[PDB]
């Protein structure tokens, strides 16, 4: 996170930390005792699926308190239209080996109704980011758990409001915009994965997830997150599955 | 109904044939008497602090 503050401790309890053989990969989001939300980039690259943790109720990366809760990943499940190595589609449903106990510093944030989502929820402005990335681009991580409020964008107005790149990724109707284009604020890698959290009437939602950005906090462009709202009866009918043996899972989309 | 100010619902809100809307929450909360707020029925219910609802 650039330009962001402390989560202070329990004020994030729904941020899962991914690791993988011990080392940082990605953020996610705790939605119920068993299920995590990520982006399905952060998995491009594993090869043994069986050294993947998720740890709940972290705060501080150099200190363990007790509040923290370690589990196995059972399954990554994947949309059938996401393609590695490229950005649409970039979501990642994880099913936890054992359920997380919810406490004061581990709650899952509510996944929306689609209707409720979209009709609402998009238009709140501000909403909150988290993680433990980058806290400058080429910058070292943190270590202490970051949050920030971004402001969301209609997709017309980020692609008018942004910089022109050339081989620049599409903004599908599967993402969103939301941040700063003045080179102060935005989310960063290591973050991945992570929520874009929207208040409602003294409730918290999942509406995003970090999932790309030309650099970090880049002058002429904003931070791009995946569209939760486009998922929610993919991700609602897969929570009501069996699981299956081999922890990677393509889930046709629709 | 549902399309403006949420149907007056705090969370979900479902339209009916004619005049009529249902407003709804989600696992974990049950709708009041007035028909739009949704109170907590659980310790940890989704989308809430705790240690910020403690005060
Ligand atoms: C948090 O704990 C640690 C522990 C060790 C390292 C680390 C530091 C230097 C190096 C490294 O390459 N060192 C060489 C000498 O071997 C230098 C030339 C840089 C001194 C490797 C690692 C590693 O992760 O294996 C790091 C660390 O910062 N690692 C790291 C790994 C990958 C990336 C990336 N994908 N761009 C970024 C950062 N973090
Ligand atoms: C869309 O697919 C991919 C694929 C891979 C990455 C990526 C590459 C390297 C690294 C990286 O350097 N990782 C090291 C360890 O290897 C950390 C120490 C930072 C965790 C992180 C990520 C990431 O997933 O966040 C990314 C990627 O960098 N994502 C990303 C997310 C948000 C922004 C922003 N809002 N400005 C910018 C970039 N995206
Ligand atoms: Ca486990």
């Not at chain 1, 949050?147 to 599967?174: A, F, H």
């Not at chain 1, 009918?237 to 046709?252: F, H, N, Q, T, Y």
Request: net charge neutral; charged share 20%.
């Amino acid at each position: 996170i650039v330009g962001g503050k402390v989560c202070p401790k329990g004020e994030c309890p729904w941020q899962v930390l991914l690791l993988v053989n011990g080392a940082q990969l990605c953020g996610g989001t705790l939605i119920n005792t068993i299920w995590v939300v990520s982006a399905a980039h952060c998995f491009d690259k594993i090869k043994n699926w069986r050294n993947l943790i998720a740890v709940l109720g972290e705060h501080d990366l150099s200190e363990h308190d007790g509040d923290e809760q370690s589990r196995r990943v059972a399954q990554v499940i994947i949309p059938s239209t996401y393609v590695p190595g490229t950005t649409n589609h970039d979501i990642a449903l994880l099913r936890l080996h054992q359920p997380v106990v919810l406490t004061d510093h581990v709650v899952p944030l509510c996944l929306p109704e689609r209707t409720f989502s979209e009709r609402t929820l998009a238009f709140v402005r501000f909403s909150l980011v988290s993680g433990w990335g980058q806290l400058l681009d080429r910058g070292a991580t943190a270590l202490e758990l970051m949050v920030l409020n971004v402001p969301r964008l209609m997709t017309q107005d980020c692609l008018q409001q942004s910089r022109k790149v050339g081989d620049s990724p599409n903004i599908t109707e599967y993402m969103f915009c939301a941040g700063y284009s003045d080179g102060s604020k935005d989310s960063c890698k290591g973050d991945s994965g992570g929520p874009h959290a929207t208040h409602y009437r003294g409730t918290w939602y999942l509406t995003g997830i970090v999932s790309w950005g030309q650099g970090c906090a880049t002058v002429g462009h904003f931070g791009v997150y995946t569209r939760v709202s486009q998922y929610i009866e993919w991700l609602q009918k897969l929570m009501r599955s069996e699981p299956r043996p081999g922890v990677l899972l393509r889930a046709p989309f629709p | 109904i549902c399309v403006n100010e949420n149907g007056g619902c705090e969370q979900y809100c479902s339209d009916h044939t004619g005049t009529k809307r249902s407003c709804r929450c989600h696992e974990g909360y049950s709708l009041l008497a007035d028909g739009v707020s949704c109170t907590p029925t659980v310790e940890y219910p989704c989308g809430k602090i705790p240690i910020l609802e403690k005060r």
